[PDB]
Amino acid sequence: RKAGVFSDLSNQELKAVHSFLWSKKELRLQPSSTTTMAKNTVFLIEMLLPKKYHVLRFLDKGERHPVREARAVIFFGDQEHPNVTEFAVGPLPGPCYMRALSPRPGYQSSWASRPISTAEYALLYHTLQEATKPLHQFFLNTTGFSFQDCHDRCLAFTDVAPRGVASGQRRSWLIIQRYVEGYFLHPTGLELLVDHGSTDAGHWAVEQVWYNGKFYGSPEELARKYADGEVDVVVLEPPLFSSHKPRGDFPSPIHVSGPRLVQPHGPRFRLEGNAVLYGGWSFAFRLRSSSGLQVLNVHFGGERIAYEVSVQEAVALYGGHTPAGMQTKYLDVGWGLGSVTHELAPGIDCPETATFLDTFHYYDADDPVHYPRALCLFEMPTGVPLRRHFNSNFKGGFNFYAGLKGQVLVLRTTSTVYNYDYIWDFIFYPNGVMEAKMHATGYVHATFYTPEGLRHGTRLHTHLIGNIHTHLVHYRVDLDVAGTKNSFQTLQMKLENITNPWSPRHRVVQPTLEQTQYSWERQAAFRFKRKLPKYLLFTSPQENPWGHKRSYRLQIHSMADQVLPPGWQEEQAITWARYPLAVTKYRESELCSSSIYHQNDPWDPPVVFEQFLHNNENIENEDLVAWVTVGFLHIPHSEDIPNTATPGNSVGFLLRPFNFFPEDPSLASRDTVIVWPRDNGPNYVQRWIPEDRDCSMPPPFSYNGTYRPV
Amino acid sequence: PRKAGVFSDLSNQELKAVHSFLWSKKELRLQPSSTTTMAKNTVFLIEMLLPKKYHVLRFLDKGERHPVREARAVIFFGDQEHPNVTEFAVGPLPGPCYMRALSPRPGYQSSWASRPISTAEYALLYHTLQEATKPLHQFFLNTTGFSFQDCHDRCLAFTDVAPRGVASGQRRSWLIIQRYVEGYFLHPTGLELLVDHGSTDAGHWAVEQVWYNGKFYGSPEELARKYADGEVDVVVLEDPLEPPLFSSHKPRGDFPSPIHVSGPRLVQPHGPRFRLEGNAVLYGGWSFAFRLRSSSGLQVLNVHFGGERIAYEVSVQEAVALYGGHTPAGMQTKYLDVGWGLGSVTHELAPGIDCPETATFLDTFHYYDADDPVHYPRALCLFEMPTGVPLRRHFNSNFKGGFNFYAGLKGQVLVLRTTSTVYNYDYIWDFIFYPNGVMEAKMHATGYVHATFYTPEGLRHGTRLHTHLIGNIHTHLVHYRVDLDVAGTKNSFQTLQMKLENITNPWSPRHRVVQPTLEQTQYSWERQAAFRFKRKLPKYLLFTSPQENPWGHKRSYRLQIHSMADQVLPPGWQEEQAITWARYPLAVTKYRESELCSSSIYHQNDPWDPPVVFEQFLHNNENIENEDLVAWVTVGFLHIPHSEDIPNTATPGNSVGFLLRPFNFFPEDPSLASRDTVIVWPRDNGPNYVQRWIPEDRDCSMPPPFSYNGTYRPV
Ligand SMILES: *[C@@H]1O[C@H](CO)[C@@H](O[C@@H]2O[C@H](CO)[C@@H](O[C@@H]3O[C@H](CO)[C@@H](O)[C@H](O)[C@@H]3O)[C@H](O)[C@H]2NC(C)=O)[C@H](O)[C@H]1NC(C)=O
Ligand SMILES: *[C@@H]1O[C@H](CO)[C@@H](O[C@@H]2O[C@H](CO)[C@@H](O)[C@H](O)[C@H]2NC(C)=O)[C@H](O)[C@H]1NC(C)=O
Ligand SMILES: *[C@@H]1O[C@H](CO)[C@@H](O[C@@H]2O[C@H](CO)[C@@H](O)[C@H](O)[C@H]2NC(C)=O)[C@H](O)[C@H]1NC(C)=O
Ligand SMILES: *[C@@H]1O[C@H](CO)[C@@H](O[C@@H]2O[C@H](CO)[C@@H](O)[C@H](O)[C@H]2NC(C)=O)[C@H](O)[C@H]1NC(C)=O
Ligand SMILES: *[C@@H]1O[C@H](CO)[C@@H](O[C@@H]2O[C@H](CO)[C@@H](O)[C@H](O)[C@H]2NC(C)=O)[C@H](O)[C@H]1NC(C)=O
């Protein structure tokens, strides 16, 4: 497989990179699990893609496999001036070198920008246990739970990000919750601000306390005001409301299992490593531990359509009445969006007939970690024919019926960082259409109910506000339509008003086809304020047999809009969210629109998408990259309890051939059925594959739930 | 289930009873539809006429008597000095006694010209062409190899466009001439003919204009002469009669990765989980009735979830395709499907292809341009199908190599489906019901595009798809009536937006917080809630009840539109009067019995002066606070054809519609009553506990062998 150039690191490869780094005594490496911040540790290891120039010479011109390398992110906490530095480690197999990457002269906030880690959370929990001792009685009286000798009645916390008011700060608002089933939905009314910037956790402090609508300065002050009767206190078997356990009764109860897919004849796609073949399609895939799912080197009918289609970032931007709520701008890549690909449940998350695939991740771990059923690949009937026609004779019969049953191939993973579960799909139809989709489910981000909260959300239970927010997702769509050099054009309908040529006293007011060409990047950077043309076309100079340029069309499915003001503070981290569509000239320095650092330094991040447009380059006959923002406003509602559900809660885009193929490319499918009438007999049912009614059983259900080194 | 009968379409027996009652009135001078003269009186359409909502609701909700059941009957009165179309309500059913005036339009003088085309009329048009084009017979043989006269397997055919003239009262049709081969829609010859067929005496009908390959010629004789004299730039077409014809669905080409076996299929060993009886459906939380109105299409009625009404009616109202063209037929074409019996062209669904092999397939009867009620096999289907994505799921990690639980609910949806194949295009009409109280309307487009003869000038109005073929640019627009009755009749309409505030940071006063807030807008008057395409459409469109949920929020349903539609024709210009609803992705009206439909069978052939002008429902700008509201939704898409549309447009990416989602209506997720949920829990030192409320299924079953009939006939 040539697709191996795109493949993630194996367990063996991750171990080899880790071993190589640990052989360097001068790095003073310690495990992720060690509970001090004043340590040097390897935070993330993942495959580092070679330059596209070299990859295409290997794929297309028969040249050598590019050098395979890893990206290694090292937290240097065990030095006077802590920082994060990244390295290219290679070659693989047999690593030799360690080359530092991406310097930022003059940038001083590297350390503060780094992701939170399990060890850091352990230290935060200790800080809280100690700092809140004065509140122990308050906790018991108001919630029946505590942090001390609490057992099955313990308080927990949820941190929000970003963590302060400026670059270099690490001051986190923490929402206190009761640790019960679906704890996300059990805020107590207390929130605490902790400064945890120092590498010495003994310096960490609670700097501010908010309880039920008022600030109190310190845990001691709240405790004293409580004792003195100066606090407006809220004192907090069917299933818990936050449980998924069934309750209630439908008027027409259902006691049996629903229909299921059977695949007695096995998969109709071929999977070899990370290479997939399905009908006209060939592609490779990878799951980038930092940023998520990608499909690469996508071909249909042996011609390239897209070099890369990848998840880049996923954001949830909140308002609130509470300090934690008004603070929250979550950026998932800052949490290992591609590393939280937890186990897919057969028959539920994917069909029982799906092919389930494991992966390995090294993200905030002591050793590479095995993730069972991290991805699945499956063919599914869509329930609607790809095409059908009833050719009537308009006299009580027919000339023929023709139809092709609808099927699609789905490549799927998930991300569950904490409360939310996103389902990430790349979908391939037999006629050369591909679709990207993200569906949201899991638990909402929620805060304690007070009346003031109703200006920033919806009351969802007695003590619970679902905060208003917008979800925004960015994708990189490096279309290479029939090859690398493309142009971008749009089509519109425009009316003309002409003399009616067969009745000159009258007029014809009718549609015409208008084509718009784009020469410079800025012309193709569409803001949310701008009218998005209905046909967004990436074109090859090659023509089809009818004289029309071979193209692929991008069709966006989104309810997104401009959320933050352009140029204001944290908006610097998400300037891509100004554009439902922007088109750039391909550059190796612009492969990603976000980073793991954006979450915790959104004020001065290492990648600012807007800057990609500053040079306003020529985009006529160039290697073009489309970048797509999709999303939706989510005002929570009571039906979101216990979880948001997927119906209507998906966004994404389609890539559709447009004059690319001389006729419908699904015509090669032998699944087509045509029914023909016959004089004085039964109809002739014409098939190119025999009718099948076989049934088989899938494997019995199992689920593991653990993800451990191997 | 008996009560759903108030909404039910007429039976074969009821249609026969209505027809017989009319035929018993000898003064009507009725003749069969098939009689080949226009100068006749005939019953063109018979369908159930829904009773007044006031009476239906008293029946359903207050225990009062079943309303009287009636049929709409449309009579073409062609056998008189001043022909017209008149409608009647015939009842009661059973035992029809009366025919009362229905939808009278006194003072309107063009009803005859406005009427739909019929099979008899097409036969007379063919006879007119056979005679009128005699001068062109040799021209036809030389340029096409096909003919109108003395043909058997090499016959010319035509496709008529509409509307038919330049003003109300005209019936002058442009006809695209084609070769009658497999997929004939895609074989234009380059000739188009304008025929005036207004007279009830077909002997007066004439070809009044001729267009061939870029030029007008006046008459068939003039073109014949110029051709004979060597003065016509002709296009000689190749013989179309081993490889399949381009317009055929027969496979050709080969995928690089061979597929030699059937793909995965649904099995349903436990049978349906929905309860379908007559036109009544129960599915978990859902209860609804349905009907297939012969004139306008699929409807779902009296839609409830959890025993509470959500919608009185959700129905297809009209489906339009508005074209441009270089040819006179192309530039004429504004097709309105209700003018062709949109709900009557529900042709046979092929099991395993059009619906899953596990679907329930239902027959119907229609009486539309027929001599007797006609049986339509497998006209509808109803099926549950896995969506492939869980309704909800969550992995509750312990962040230390394990979990606290996994919970998930497998995705299923109930689909009620029919189709419409008037001629070239096949639309697939779905109403879909999710177990969490979300319902969705969807239309998918497939079949053959409307196409004209290629010349270079055609490229300003379309795409060259084959040697001699232009796919004309057009826009599809569909109108839906959405009579939401959220928890009952009296509702209001409101919208929600996000608006930023900029405040002092309350914990760091030197700084600012610029953040989202929730903004609510109330609407009091119809005009305020008529959203034009140029207007910003709010992201939350809510229909509210005054009743509050347990958390103090008003019980609502949210409308979410999936569309790429835009304004097509200029508001107020000529034929736009027929489609003024297409100005509005959403408009909200006060319920009225005189405003039940936004279109009619008459709109297609008199778009200039039609019997219903949707804009008129907004003229009185009525108060819409605590009233019976009706939402009306336009969905659609611009379709610039492309070579992948040959032989047929395909469904992927070619659907539009809307969702209705509960919004603070239920106290928590209404799917929680589903016993399909599975939760897996960890156990110390043991295997996990898989908690279920329905046992694991791996049973098997087989569907019946495929069959397909293809005929639709009286029974
Ligand atoms: C559309 O055509 C229908 C059918 O021809 C018209 O209804 C018919 O109207 C005539 C009146 O012209 C009625 O004829 C008879 O007139 C004599 C008077 O000499 C009267 O004594 C009889 O009682 C009878 O009414 C005829 O009954 C009536 N037919 C039906 C089925 O209603 C209709 O008026 C035309 N519509 C328009 C708007 O012109
Ligand atoms: C971040 O910390 C790293 C590691 O301490 C620094 O990298 C070292 O730089 C010194 C001085 O140039 C070299 O002698 C060492 O070889 C480096 N060590 C490694 C492992 O690369 C680095 O200078 C700091 N980065 C910044 C921007 O200050
Ligand atoms: C299309 O163009 C025609 C011709 O310019 C416009 O018709 C004119 O309209 C004005 C104002 O109503 C009249 O006074 C003229 O007599 C009309 N001229 C002719 C030749 O008909 C027409 O309004 C235009 N329509 C649209 C929708 O733009
Ligand atoms: C999850 O998977 C792991 C790995 O397969 C299971 O651990 C194995 O358990 C088997 C059965 O007892 C033992 O024979 C092996 O010693 C274990 N292998 C390893 C590598 O640890 C584990 O039991 C599974 N957990 C659950 C809850 O199903
Ligand atoms: C939010 O409001 C603040 C306060 O009015 C704005 O901050 C001021 O901005 C101007 C520059 O236009 C400065 O001269 C002032 O010194 C600022 N005042 C304070 C108190 O900070 C701020 O620009 C507003 N931001 C947005 C996005 O509207």
Ligand SMILES: *[C@@H]1O[C@H](CO)[C@@H](O[C@@H]2O[C@H](CO)[C@@H](O)[C@H](O)[C@H]2NC(C)=O)[C@H](O)[C@H]1NC(C)=O
């Ligand atoms: C279409 O359906 C009709 C009605 O079932 C079929 O007509 C019957 O054909 C069978 C022969 O298999 C005869 O026994 C019956 O007498 C026929 N009944 C009627 C009412 O005509 C018809 O054969 C079917 N056509 C096709 C092509 O399958």
Ligand SMILES: [Ca+2]
């Ligand atoms: Ca650039």
Ligand SMILES: [Ca+2]
């Ligand atoms: Ca490219």
Ligand SMILES: [Ca+2]
């Ligand atoms: Ca009104």
Ligand SMILES: [Ca+2]
């Ligand atoms: Ca209503």
Ligand SMILES: [Cu+2]
């Ligand atoms: Cu959300």
Ligand SMILES: [Cu+2]
């Ligand atoms: Cu179309």
